[PDB]
Amino acid sequence: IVGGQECKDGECPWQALLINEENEGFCGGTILSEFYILTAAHCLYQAKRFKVRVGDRNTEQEEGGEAVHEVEVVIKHNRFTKETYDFDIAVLRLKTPITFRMNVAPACLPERDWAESTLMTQKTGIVSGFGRTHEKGRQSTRLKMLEVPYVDRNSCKLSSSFIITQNMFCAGYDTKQEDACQGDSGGPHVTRFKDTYFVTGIVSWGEGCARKGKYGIYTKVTAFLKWIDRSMKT
Amino acid sequence: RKLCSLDNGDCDQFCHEEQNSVVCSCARGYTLADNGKACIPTGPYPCGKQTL
Numbered sequence: 001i002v003g004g005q006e007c008k009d010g011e012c013p014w015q016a017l018l019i020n021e022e023n024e025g026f027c028g029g030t031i032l033s034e035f036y037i038l039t040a041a042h043c044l045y046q047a048k049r050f051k052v053r054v055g056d057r058n059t060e061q062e063e064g065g066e067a068v069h070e071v072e073v074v075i076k077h078n079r080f081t082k083e084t085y086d087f088d089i090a091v092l093r094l095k096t097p098i099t100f101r102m103n104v105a106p107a108c109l110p111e112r113d114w115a116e117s118t119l120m121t122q123k124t125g126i127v128s129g130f131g132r133t134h135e136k137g138r139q140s141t142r143l144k145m146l147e148v149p150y151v152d153r154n155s156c157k158l159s160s161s162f163i164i165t166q167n168m169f170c171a172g173y174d175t176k177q178e179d180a181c182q183g184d185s186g187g188p189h190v191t192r193f194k195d196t197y198f199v200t201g202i203v204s205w206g207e208g209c210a211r212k213g214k215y216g217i218y219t220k221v222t223a224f225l226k227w228i229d230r231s232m233k234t
Numbered sequence: 235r236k237l238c239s240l241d242n243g244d245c246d247q248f249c250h251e252e253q254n255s256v257v258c259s260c261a262r263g264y265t266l267a268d269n270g271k272a273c274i275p276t277g278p279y280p281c282g283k284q285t286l
């Protein structure tokens with residue numbers, strides 16, 4: 001996360017962190033329930049074998065709320081394309097259930113119609129992760145969150161040097177130095193409605209990070225709600 | 235500014251318009267209150283809530 005603030009105690013409880021064989025975080029995820037994690041399908045390519053860590057806010061200490069979970073099933077979208085990052089969604093079923101506590105709680109899955117018309121028409125959403133703090137910078141040892149405004153579909157299509165499919169949407173700033181970045185991918189993009197947070201996106205990609213004239217591109221979760229559902233029942 | 239467009243229809247979460255009317259609903263882990271608008275957590279750590 002470039003810019004933004006630190007997630008304070010109990011502020012980003014749905015944040016999950018995919019860790020590799022060397023226990024280094026390489027992608028993010030969103031807790032959907034005790035057994036399911038939502039992440040990006042392109043992340044399943046960044047590591048040979050991985051696990052999911054929850055309740056972490058500082059990868060430099062052992063706060064005591066952290067818990068590592070093994071993945072029992074990886075459910076990636078059958079139509080994901082590495083070439084365009086289209087259909088960049090994956091659901092992970094954990095071997096053992098996540099026990100909710102402080103800093104470990106699920107984000108709500110909204111209903112499509114209500115979400116697209118009431119949630120995504122809101123001014124901003126929140127993106128979070130342990131990803132890079134710069135384009136060349138190192139990753140964050142601290143979990144960060146960033147309030148990113150929703151960006152007009154047309155404006156974003158114009159801004160991008162790459163196709164923005166129907167399964168993506170954009171958020172971020174035009175010139176301001178604030179945006180998700182590498183390592184945040186797969187992470188949550190949530191929208192608050194009356195003190196309750198709903199998952200609205202999956203950190204997907206962007207051209208660089210916080211680059212002027214470029215926005216962060218997220219998987220349009222509202223377009224995969226029926227898919228997530230049959231996935232969380234298999 | 236009608237139904238779900240006028241303040242989410244007074245619903246806590248999901249708002250739907252059925253037969254020219256507002257019908258509220260909630261995410262899994264919440265139950266619609268008796269007023270048919272508010273959403274009450276069914277247990278500890280309901281989705282979408284920052285932990286305290």
Ligand SMILES: N=C(N)c1cccc(CN2CCN(S(=O)(=O)c3cc4ccc(Cl)cc4s3)CC2=O)c1
Pocket residue numbers: 083084085162179180181182183185203204205206207208209210215216217218
């Ligand atoms: N070949 C393509 N289709 C392509 C299209 C756009 C960008 C890139 C290369 N690329 C891929 C991803 N990284 S990153 O890991 O640093 C990310 C930056 C960023 C910024 C915002 C959001 Cl929402 C998500 C991400 S991932 C940035 C970057 O420049 C490749």
Ligand SMILES: [Ca+2]
Pocket residue numbers: 056057058059060061062063064066
């Ligand atoms: Ca820690």
